[PDB]
Amino acid sequence: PERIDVDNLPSPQDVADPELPPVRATSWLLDGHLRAYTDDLARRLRGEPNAHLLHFADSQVVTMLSSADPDQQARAQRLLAGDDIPPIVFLPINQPNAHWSLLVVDRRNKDAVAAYHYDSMAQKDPQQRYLADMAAYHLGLDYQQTHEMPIAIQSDGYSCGDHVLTGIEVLAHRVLDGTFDYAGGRDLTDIEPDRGLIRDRLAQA
Amino acid sequence: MQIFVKTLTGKTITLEVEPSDTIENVKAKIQDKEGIPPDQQRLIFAGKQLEDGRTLSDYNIQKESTLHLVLRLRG
């Protein structure tokens, strides 16, 4: 006996991590940090016009798209590419224990889907675009059509996560203003990430 | 007794553990088999995260149980 409660368990990626280390001035960002930031952002945009078009994807779900288990990758596609899923999706792309980069997919036009990849590294790694291609491939897109877009070049070896979070926040406010669609609307050449503001968001959330 | 550990990329890791084994000890076995340091491993069972200082028996984990291994991704 000694019955164990299994009534309505969360999926593994939604289980909390109470031992999640705090972020500092020079540490690399973790996936738990990225999600805490986007969970708070989605809350700050709630009720604003056009906020219903955005969806910030969990990085763990981005990796499940390439899972060898077919049930897992099907769950990821239901979470990222369904009829009730917002058409503008932000996918964090992780090179394990190395780098972070951003991939955006816009599905407003179902007969022509646009994809944008942002990589803040000075000399780009072919392996990073490869992982962005796998994500688009598993989302039913042609990876050859993904655009390699401009973003501010990191001047340290730890703020690639900051560039990802800042680009997500900056672009989201452009969807709210309607400037996302102007010429150069998806250009992030002039962003300036702020470690202190990011730490502030995580504290007061 | 043999337990199973499933990652989110579709890999199952099998282990030969004892009920008296600690959570930290199980993680070292996973390090031995896959090279992942224990500072990155998050073991999950019945939708709950396991504390390093408890035992497999404390969580009523029986033979052939399935655990989830979620990683702390960094960059």
Numbering used by the authors:
A (entry chain A): 311 to 515
B (entry chain B): 1 to 75
Task: Quote the passages of the study that discuss this structure, keeping the authors' original sentences.
CE clan proteases, specific hydrolases for ubiquitin-like modifications (SUMO and NEDD8) in eukaryotes, reportedly serve as bacterial effector proteins with deSUMOylase, deubiquitinase, or, even, acetyltransferase activities. Here, we characterize bacterial CE protease activities, revealing K63-linkage-specific deubiquitinases in human pathogens, such as Salmonella, Escherichia, and Shigella, as well as ubiquitin/ubiquitin-like cross-reactive enzymes in Chlamydia, Rickettsia, and Xanthomonas. Five crystal structures, including ubiquitin/ubiquitin-like complexes, explain substrate specificities and redefine relationships across the CE clan. A comparison to the previously determined SENP2-SUMO2 and NEDP1∼NEDD8 complexes (Reverter and Lima, 2004, Reverter et al., 2005, Shen et al., 2005) revealed differences among bacterial CE DUBs in three variable regions (VRs) near the substrate binding (S1) site that were arranged around a structurally conserved helix (constant region, CR).
To understand what structural adaptations enable XopD cross-reactivity, we determined the crystal structures of covalent XopD∼Ub (2.9 Å) and XopD∼tSUMO (2.1 Å) complexes. The XopD∼Ub structure contained four copies in the asymmetric unit, all of which were similar (0.62 Å root-mean-square deviation [RMSD] over XopD and Ub; Figure S3D). To our surprise, the VR-1 responsible for much of the observed XopD protease activity was not a β-hairpin as had been observed in eukaryotic Ubl proteases, but, instead, was extended and devoid of secondary structure. In the Ub-bound structure, XopD VR-1 threads underneath the Ub Ile44 hydrophobic patch, with residues Pro322 and Val325 making contacts to Ub Ile44 and His68, and also coordinates Ub Arg72 with Asp327 (foreground). Additionally, Met374 of VR-2 contacts the Leu8 loop of Ub (background). Incorporation of either I44A or R72A mutations into Ub suicide probes resulted in a dramatic loss in reactivity to XopD. When mapped to the XopD∼Ub crystal structure, the changes observed in the NMR titration experiment nicely agree with contacts made between XopD VR-1 and the Ub Ile44 patch. In contrast, mutations targeting the primary Ub interaction in VR-1 (P322D, V325D, and D327R) all showed decreased activity toward Ub substrates with little-to-no effect on tSUMO recognition. Arg72 of Ub is well-coordinated in the XopD∼Ub structure, as well as in other Ub-bound DUB structures (Ye et al., 2011).
